[PDB]
Amino acid sequence: LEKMASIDVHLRQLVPGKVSEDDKLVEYDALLLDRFLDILQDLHGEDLRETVQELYEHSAEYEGKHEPKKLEELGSVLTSLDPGDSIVIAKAFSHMLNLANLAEEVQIAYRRRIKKLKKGDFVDESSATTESDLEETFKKLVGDLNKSPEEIFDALKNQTVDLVLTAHPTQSVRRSLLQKHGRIRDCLAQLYAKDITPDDKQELDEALQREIQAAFRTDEIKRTPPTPQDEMRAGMSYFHETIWKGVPKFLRRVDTALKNIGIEERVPYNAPLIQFSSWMGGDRDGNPRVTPEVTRDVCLLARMMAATMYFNQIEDLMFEMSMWRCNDELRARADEVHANSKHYIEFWKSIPTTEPYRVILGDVRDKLYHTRERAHQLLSNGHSDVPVEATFINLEQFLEPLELCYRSLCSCGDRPIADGSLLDFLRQVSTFGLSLVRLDIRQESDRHTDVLDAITTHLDIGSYREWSEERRQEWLLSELSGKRPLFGSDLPKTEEIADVLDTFHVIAELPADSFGAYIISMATAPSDVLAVELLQRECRVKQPLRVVPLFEKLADLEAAPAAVARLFSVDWYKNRINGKQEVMIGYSDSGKDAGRLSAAWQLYKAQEELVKVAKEYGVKLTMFHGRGGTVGRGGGPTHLAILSQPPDTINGSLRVTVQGEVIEQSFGEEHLCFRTLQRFTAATLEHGMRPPISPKPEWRALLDEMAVVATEEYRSVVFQEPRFVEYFRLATPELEYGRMNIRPSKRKPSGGIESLRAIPWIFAWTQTRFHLPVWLGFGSAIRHVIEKDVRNLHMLQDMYQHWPFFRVTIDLIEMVFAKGDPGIAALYDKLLVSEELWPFGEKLRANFEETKKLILQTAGHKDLLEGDPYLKQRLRLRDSYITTLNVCQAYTLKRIRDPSYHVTLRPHISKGLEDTLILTMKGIAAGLQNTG
Amino acid sequence: TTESDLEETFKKLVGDLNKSPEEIFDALKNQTVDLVLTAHPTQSVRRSLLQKHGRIRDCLAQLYAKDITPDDKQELDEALQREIQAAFRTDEIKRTPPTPQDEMRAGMSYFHETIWKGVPKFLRRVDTALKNIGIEERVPYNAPLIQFSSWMGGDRDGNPRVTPEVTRDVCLLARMMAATMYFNQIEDLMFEMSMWRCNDELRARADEVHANSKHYIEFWKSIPTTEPYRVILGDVRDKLYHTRERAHQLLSNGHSDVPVEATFINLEQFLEP
Amino acid sequence: LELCYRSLCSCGDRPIADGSLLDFLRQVSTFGLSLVRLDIRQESDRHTDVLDAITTHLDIGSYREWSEERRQEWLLSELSGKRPLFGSDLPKTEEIADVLDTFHVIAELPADSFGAYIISMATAPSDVLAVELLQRECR
Ligand SMILES: [Cl-]
Ligand SMILES: [Cl-]
Ligand SMILES: [Cl-]
């Protein structure tokens, strides 16, 4: 069998050059592809393997030269398959793509960094190969900015990176498949060690094939569109994978680099340099399955996982903490704890007072066990019997004895011992707390409007809905300044109103350690924030959540600093916020309203103005970056994006969404996790002391014109074109995506793109390799300013080379274009769109090509991603696998929607099209990862 | 430095003695090395110091890797000093002339150290070396090429501290440690066994086990019949837990309440599923 | 028990039903599930203190200074209205918390256990209205 010779050729034709000297990516992918196809032949026959290989060879042939003949060949084969062979081929290409992603992660993890490749400016910070590590960022602050070491250390102490993990917009990959992927990565890595013996290599190859087959032989359908509890279980997998051990690894590295610049202290173990938040189970915005019980559930589950990991982790700590010399305080506490009544009988019959650290640590272990057991009982029943005094309820109870051990050990010169497992444990307690993640709530402001309208209607004051914004403000301010409650059990509650109030009741019935922020979707005016503050207090929330408005539409972004100023001017709100105010901006959402360029530039300006307001009133402004941003990309780019943020918008608290489509690339691997946490911490540290350049005024004026032209084009296409929605429902799988499910994709099932949610808007166009929501508007803007003045191109180029914000924006567009193909979208059109609607797509695709050519001119590139050949190489590798899933999805849709489209089937190939469709959706989605 | 490894021994038997690969394989099948662990003639080193010694070895090893970065080397050096001082600052005289139960606990440390993972690694290497002489089979998994016996708690010759209760104790402790390790290992085994295609016999057993009414709520709300290997293995996990808890009760009391039918008493019950 | 009595009478076994069964029924009726029904008793001055902390916390004045008719007015508007009176955000002294807790205990137990709430030193209708109000507002 010399089929292996052919796939070696096609891969080498797809990626011919070597982007370094350790570039083994083509080798890795060829190895995985050979093993997988062999497994495929063994399991489903020779004819099936030859069919799959012919399809892939044709797809790589397409992604090389883009001859539409190749697409016609792929389709010719893919329609002749009966549904069974269709499912097999789709599953096959999904898994091959996953293997390609693992090869990429190995390459990135072990690519040698080249110090002679850095240029010396901020552009270095846009790729992992040249970005500054923590110590390079330190020395850069010391050299260019004359910042003293002790200043850098103080800055680090009070800094916080808060990563918010979101549910996957499609398949949150199972925890088991995460582990199998990890095994495949490890086998792949060790196979290329320059010291492995032939028997080690044979057994490694055997384990690699073994794992690949294990992955291919598990189903990814059936059961339910996973309950939010299950989705949350899968989401927390990355703590067991890399993050739990990874946090203290990173922190210790910070300690080392601080030493390597003269700082003799360590980063205080309680300092929250890294924190994690979760939306899984808390985001209700247009999502009815997220009920109050779901929220209580995910809080309790998280507390169980936390207690569990602390329990298993603390035993090794007990083995290490065998000293006897100790502090008088610790001696007293050990004798005190020894006066009491089973969880260490395999280790020691009982812990003697001659190992006091083990005594106290054993008590902490016991309390941890009782905490897990208690939370389990509350989850599965509703009450416990476990005395809350026998558990840990707040973080200070947990930290107090551990800190006693640390101080005590330091009293006796055992500081080095204390800086071991004890230090890593303390740092885990500070990072993860009793809950691992803190839950963020999100809800439409209209739902609070419904609650308050039923409240006022019940009190015979009128309808809160009819009242003007200022009349609402008056009522809410008088009610907040008074102490008299609002309502009781005697309140006509609809289904939605009861859901809202019950949500708040659940928030009040749980520890405040479990919750982060309550976030108001579709925020427009101060009554929307005041409403939530009021409902919180009237639901008896003891320690109330900080209320964070999410300004989405364009006019809302223009109105935002005024609304935040009015809020800051009210004494009640100024006293409640205690000098901190958080505002959420959703790049994807704002782009859905007004196109991407206008949304970006409007968000930069809005952050500037909000900083002006917060400086006026002495409020520390923290910006929360939602899905779609430049800070949501994977890897290197994130660094520059953080550096690019407007000055004094971060201020020691960076809050970014870790989008589901990227979390594997950011935390799936040990090294990847370290370098992610590193670039977040270093980029935050530097931006706090080295703001990006203030834009030249001609840049701001130019961007204002471009924003105008862009939004005009975008809205004229998406909203004003009457026969757009029809095209949207044909040229795109949005309808099938909503009908299948994931969640609901429409707030109002009967409306238009306005009421369509942002995630399905981005997704629907991402599946067809078209990405309309990301680039529409750039074309007419760049075109218009180049025509208005010959020299304006030179200005745009100037910005791309010197203004970080503009560079990161244009770069993201460039990357999305690297993922795009107008011919595939044209294939979807040819199969699913009416003939009289064909020119509509045609013109749109013209806008694509022109915008592509225009973006290049701004960046000074002749090809796409000319400045980051590593990423270009990787995306080129994936596209060959994804394209097959494209043709298959298009023809599958034509087969589902039209039973009048009969095809001469081919006989089934060796040992319900909807399952195929879901496979292609998950595959294409997983391969394209983040766009906009 | 010059002794024959497993494969060099294979090649010497095949070349110099004209023994066929089949004969070597049968001889291996029916062969058994039974290693008997005896109590230490003085200090049976504590388990904590065994782990500290292991860490010191690991730091020393990684410090001389020809590919480590300056920061890794710096942090490894610090971890080595940390462990050396950690070892030196523990007392080893105080308390009791360790109860034979304690001496036995310390003796069994090496199963957790290297042996538990070490046995299947060695066996797998036997499989590889057998492939390299033409043998397509693996060494049968139930064939006892390696066995472990212990005198800790059983040798009474001129040693009155070894009472019958001491023997009962070390037997129950050993069954506990075994049940623990099987329980912890079968978790990862359950994550791996996510297939759906299965045997008619195994399908029957999976549907049958599904006919019943807690140890996997952090992983899966419940295991469905579309993951039958996870069904059978989850039941085995449950039986392991009941075995450990039962032995714990028998050790600490003298009776249980755990029905012996819900545990593993003999090896065939364990191996069958 | 009543089913048993009816049944025995059905078959002309009334004399039997008028025996231990009758004594049992009568004991169930006389003593109920508690033997006795507890009467609560508290001074009116303490309810005045609770209402004073409530009105002071609402910045409407001090219920203690109010005339008997002003008290009556406020208590009646509160009783006919549908908006509650106070919440957890309430400065409770030891005695004030004691009174409110008494009402909470009364709300958390079966009504078979209680008889009457009795106001020591009663002088004017505001004291009775006060207890009725606190009763309704402690659920
Ligand atoms: Cl659940
Ligand atoms: Cl800042
Ligand atoms: Cl014992």
Curated annotation (Swiss-Prot), chain A:
Describe how expression is induced or repressed.
Answer: Upon inorganic phosphate (Pi) deprivation.
Pfam families associated with the record: PEPcase
Give the cofactor note text: Magnesium. Can also use manganese.
Domain of life, per UniProt, equals Eukaryota
The protein's pH behavior is summarized as: Optimum pH is 8-9.
User: Annotated Gene Ontology MF terms?
Assistant: phosphoenolpyruvate carboxylase activity
Q: Which leading EC class covers this enzyme?
A: lyase
Specify where it is mainly localized: cytoplasm
User: Where does it localize?
Assistant: Cytoplasm
GO biological-process terms attached to the record: carbon fixation; cellular response to phosphate starvation; leaf development; photosynthesis; protein tetramerization; tricarboxylic acid cycle
According to its UniProt record, how is this protein modified after translation? The phosphorylation of Ser-6 is reversibly promoted by inorganic phosphate (Pi) deprivation. Enhanced activity by phosphorylation at pH 7.3 by lowering Km and sensitivity to inhibition by L-malate and L-aspartate, while enhancing activation by glucose 6-phosphate.
Name the cofactor(s) required for activity, per the record: Mg(2+); Mn(2+)
- Keywords associated with the record: Allosteric enzyme, Carbon dioxide fixation, Cytoplasm, Lyase, Magnesium, Manganese, Phosphoprotein, Photosynthesis
> Membrane-crossing residues?
none
Q: How does it assemble?
A: Homotetramer.
Task: Indicate the family of this protein.
Answer: Belongs to the PEPCase type 1 family.
Name of the molecule in the record: Phosphoenolpyruvate carboxylase 1
- Gene encoding this polypeptide? PPC1
